[PDB]
Symmetry: C3
Subunit: 281 residues, 3 copies
């Protein structure tokens, strides 16, 4: 199944017939960071299995739904579940849900993820507003856009210089200042490690030399598909650990430690994103 205009249109028509919500905001939440989706008002849950042309999501298993409703008086659509490229999904499978968001009317996409810190100023539990990226898969012929271009969505050769909207970053910071947590909020450059192995100690040292502030295994594919079709993006990393300090001290990382940091910041992040949604222009 190709992420083309006909296939996206069939999915969008189905969603419309079922939901009667026309969203202008989309959200994708990182693992352990999805409690906001549980508080959507007047919500309608649409499983991927019912949506024409959506990818199968039961080899990896676990959840896989679209949730439409209201937050802070705004009409939104949330992606629940996980579709990451380290799982073996194709370019076309990652792109189709974002292109359907476009056809439903989405103009702004908000994303959170879990990442490792590279910059020496970053502590476990800090937040990073992403201002740019280094896309190792893209440099290496695994860009999400490799394949025929789908002209109805965007151009053959997109420019990513404004992929991360500046005014959205400024609003996120303004809210942090209003609630006395700006000391936790930084800005920086996100390195995309295809994964699923964590960055090795020597890879972390390389990323420091190359000007990266954080590293993770998601987000950049969705950002590129959104930018290609004219959707504005805000992306925020939660820092699980500092990989440079861990390399210098011979300290390990694991998914359990990552999930405990997610639990420690889950309430703060949910409240922050609810306020961002409410105040978006």
């Amino acid at each position: 199944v190709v992420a083309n205009y006909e296939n996206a249109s069939m999915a969008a028509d189905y969603i419309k017939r079922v939901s009667n919500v026309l969203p202008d905001i989309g959200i994708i939440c990182g693992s352990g960071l999805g409690k906001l989706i549980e508080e959507i008002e007047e919500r309608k849950v649409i499983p991927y299995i019912n949506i024409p042309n959506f990818p199968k999501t039961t080899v990896a298993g676990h959840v896989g739904n679209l949730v439409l409703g209201s937050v802070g008086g705004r009409k939104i659509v949330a992606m629940q579940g996980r579709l990451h490229m380290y799982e073996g999904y194709s370019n076309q499978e990652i792109a189709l849900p974002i292109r359907v968001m476009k056809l439903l009317g989405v103009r702004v996409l908000l994303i959170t993820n879990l990442a490792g810190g590279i910059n020496r100023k970053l502590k476990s539990g800090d937040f990073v507003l992403i201002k740019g990226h280094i896309n190792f898969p893209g440099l290496g012929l695994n860009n999400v856009l490799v394949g025929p271009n789908q002209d109805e969505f965007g151009p053959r050769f997109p420019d990513l210089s404004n992929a991360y909207d500046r005014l959205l970053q400024q609003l996120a910071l303004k809210i942090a200042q209003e609630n006395d947590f700006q000391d936790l909020v930084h800005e920086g450059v996100y390195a995309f490690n295809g994964g699923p192995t964590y960055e090795s100690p020597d890879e972390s040292n390389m990323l420091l030399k190359l000007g990266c502030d954080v590293v993770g295994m998601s987000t950049v594919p969705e950002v590129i598909i959104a930018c290609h079709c004219g959707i504005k993006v805000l992306a925020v990393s939660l820092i699980a650990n500092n990989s440079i300090l861990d390399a210098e001290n011979d300290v390990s990382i694991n998914h359990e430690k990552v999930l405990a940091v997610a639990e420690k910041r889950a309430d703060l992040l949910q409240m922050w994103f609810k306020e961002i949604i409410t105040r978006l222009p």
Copy 2:
């Protein structure tokens, strides 16, 4: 279809029966930079669709032909059309036309492309004689030679240290000096970005740190296939923009701006390559 000896031989036999030209020079011209192909004398046009085993080129659409004839008294074969890896073509599809050139008798391959400038000395409209490369796809397991080796063409483990012939670079520069445009001509290292997104501002800054002078989305696959089978190469980049200055100033790039630079230098480049062809040893 594999780029093997039998499949290449069948294509070569067809071309011979149709053309009665045995070329010793091949040319591949960048987008907007192909007017030279229109001035080939006594020309014969052979569409890919008629050549046994050649790849299909109608999903991307647009042109796709081989043109054989004379330029400056020399027998040449030109590739018209575009076969780039960001479009989804396989290793075997990119390699087959170059291996057919080898079987027809080609000893020298001349290539032009459009690229972004990384070195601070480079201005829009300048030319770069490529003296080496950094192949991000190759480091990352997407080299054009991944797969079984085709022993009739070359070795399992090729050396690329002489991929860009030094005497051909010197002749290109000599002609520039003779015609008072040497101030536009530089030498440098080409970074291969698989594409199709332009390099991000932070990727451009990384490439500066790593010793790259220019960046583009083509050329390196063809260079590697040519070097593997003993064909000498000259490759020249036309600089569309300086990506480091654009990153520092928050300035965008698009395919339209790139094509306007191609128009501004098209006549000069056509005249330069005609003289290179005439004077090749």
Copy 3:
């Protein structure tokens, strides 16, 4: 064929019925560096073609066997043949033999390879104990673990910080000191170049900037599969040449030169690994 628990179990059951050896040590030897396999005592040779689910190894051709027996009073299993990713084998094909080693009882995996030197201190004929790596394929979405996770073997997100066991490196060095060849033995970081082209001169210069000591086209995939399932690893590179000196002097490299260095060090390496095997805890 997927490298899953059922398929690995069927292969392991076959091997057991044929061999009556339960090995706790596995070995993978680099090209020209396999004479040790010829001295295995009470050996049983099991060709891949007879083992349920093992990959086909006749396109590349040449040898392909498992050899079980005793060395220095220890029970071992050796992989004879070559399964490298530049040949076009899939993630699942590389991983299956290592996962079968796990099911047979292997706890330690010993690996040798041929590599190019980047650090200026390295001479042709030196040895490097690998202490970490930079995995360009992994950063670029070609990690050996891309795909569904096989939960019986290991976790979705492995940590590689202890992939290269420190005590095994210390034992290898102790034996070198006991036999007056420690002047040949270094430690360092291994860069994985997917291949099959040797690193270009400008790629070599980049790797120097990024903190790499050696570069090669193997080893990292097997290390990652072993680490994922709890097998300890020692990996040693034999240096064929110094690629930084060769770049500065305009000197070429070829597979013939590499194989002559392998011949020059083959006896020393065979004797070293026999003593390592004998003395493993």
